[PDB]
Scaffold this motif. Structure first.
Motif, PDB file in Angstrom:
ATOM      1  N   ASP A  27       0.943  -1.167  -0.085  1.00 19.75           N
ATOM      2  CA  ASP A  27       0.044   0.052  -0.013  1.00 19.75           C
ATOM      3  C   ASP A  27       0.881   1.213  -0.048  1.00 19.75           C
ATOM      4  N   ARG A  31       1.039   3.605  -3.320  1.00 22.59           N
ATOM      5  CA  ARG A  31       0.480   5.152  -3.082  1.00 22.59           C
ATOM      6  C   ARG A  31       1.488   6.080  -3.357  1.00 22.59           C
ATOM      7  N   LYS A  34       1.589   6.253  -7.187  1.00 21.37           N
ATOM      8  CA  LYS A  34       0.275   6.829  -7.528  1.00 21.37           C
ATOM      9  C   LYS A  34       0.177   8.498  -7.168  1.00 21.37           C
ATOM     10  N   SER A  35       0.747   9.004  -5.910  1.00 20.92           N
ATOM     11  CA  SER A  35       0.436  10.356  -5.816  1.00 20.92           C
ATOM     12  C   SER A  35       1.506  11.125  -6.350  1.00 20.92           C
ATOM     13  N   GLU A  52      -2.474  -0.814 -11.212  1.00 22.60           N
ATOM     14  CA  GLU A  52      -2.673  -1.012  -9.823  1.00 22.60           C
ATOM     15  C   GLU A  52      -2.558  -2.298  -9.640  1.00 22.60           C
ATOM     16  N   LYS A  56       0.042  -4.765  -7.721  1.00 18.72           N
ATOM     17  CA  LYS A  56      -0.573  -5.554  -6.724  1.00 18.72           C
ATOM     18  C   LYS A  56      -0.026  -6.878  -6.817  1.00 18.72           C
ATOM     19  N   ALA A 110       2.873   9.149   2.243  1.00 18.73           N
ATOM     20  CA  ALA A 110       2.464   7.811   1.919  1.00 18.73           C
ATOM     21  C   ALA A 110       2.350   6.922   3.196  1.00 18.73           C
ATOM     22  N   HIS A 113      -0.351   7.964   5.631  1.00 21.95           N
ATOM     23  CA  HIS A 113      -1.736   7.769   5.025  1.00 21.95           C
ATOM     24  C   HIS A 113      -1.910   6.561   5.005  1.00 21.95           C
ATOM     25  N   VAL A 114      -1.269   5.653   4.754  1.00 22.34           N
ATOM     26  CA  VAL A 114      -1.680   3.880   4.776  1.00 22.34           C
ATOM     27  C   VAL A 114      -1.907   3.619   6.581  1.00 22.34           C
ATOM     28  N   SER A 117      -5.143   5.135   7.234  1.00 23.28           N
ATOM     29  CA  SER A 117      -6.346   4.265   6.716  1.00 23.28           C
ATOM     30  C   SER A 117      -6.499   2.878   7.231  1.00 23.28           C
TER      31      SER A 117
END
Ligand code: HEM
Length: 152
Positions: A27, A31, A34-35, A52, A56, A110, A113-114, A117
């Motif tokens: 993750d 991220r 991705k960001s 993704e 993954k 990142a 954030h993970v 979450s």
């Protein structure tokens, strides 16, 4: 630079992470890529990953993610006494890889954030504050170390 209690909060989360290093690892990386896709170019090896799912699915990546957190985890449990551990990391990221400090700020984001979450009930204000600080001490240490190597 952190208080004993902040350490504990840090380490108290870290313990959750450790229950699924690989999962957090993915993750985290995903991220980041991705960001801030630009960070993706530093990975000759993951740069061919278009989605993704494809990320993954990569064994390599996932593997790489356990490596990052393993090292990171090692420093954090040193509660500031991490020269030994920190040095080798700075040499290669400075020398081999060339990772700018801004890039560390990005992965730092990142991370938080993970965790937030996945671990809400364990990742409140104080605990999120404590982790931030921890990430700042590491990044600071790294940066000095970079200059001393003649990087930045
Ligand atoms: C928490 C901050 C970071 C830690 C703890 C970390 C840790 C590591 C570790 C333990 C390795 C394995 C061997 C080596 O030192 O070369 C590694 C490799 C590497 N790191 Fe990092 N890293 C971090 C951030 C980053 C970031 C932000 C970037 C680029 C945006 C980056 C780029 C790389 C690359 C390209 C390699 C080599 C990949 C490979 O094995 O092909 N690192 N990192």
């Amino acid at each position: 630079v952190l208080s004993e209690g902040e350490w504990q909060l840090v380490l108290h989360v870290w313990a959750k992470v450790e229950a699924d290093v690989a999962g957090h690892g993915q993750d985290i990386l995903i991220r980041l890529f991705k960001s801030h896709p630009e960070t993706l170019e530093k990975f000759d090896r993951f740069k061919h990953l278009k989605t993704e799912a494809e990320m993954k699915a990569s064994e390599d990546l996932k593997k790489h993610g356990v490596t990052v957190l393993t090292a990171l985890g090692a420093i954090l449990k040193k509660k500031g006494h991490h020269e030994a551990e920190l040095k080798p990391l700075a040499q290669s990221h400075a020398t081999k890889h060339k990772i700018p400090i801004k890039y560390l700020e990005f992965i730092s984001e990142a991370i938080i954030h993970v965790l937030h979450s996945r671990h809400p009930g364990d990742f409140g204000a104080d605990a999120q504050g404590a982790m931030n600080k921890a990430l700042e001490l590491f990044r600071k240490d790294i940066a000095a170390k970079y200059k001393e190597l003649g990087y930045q």
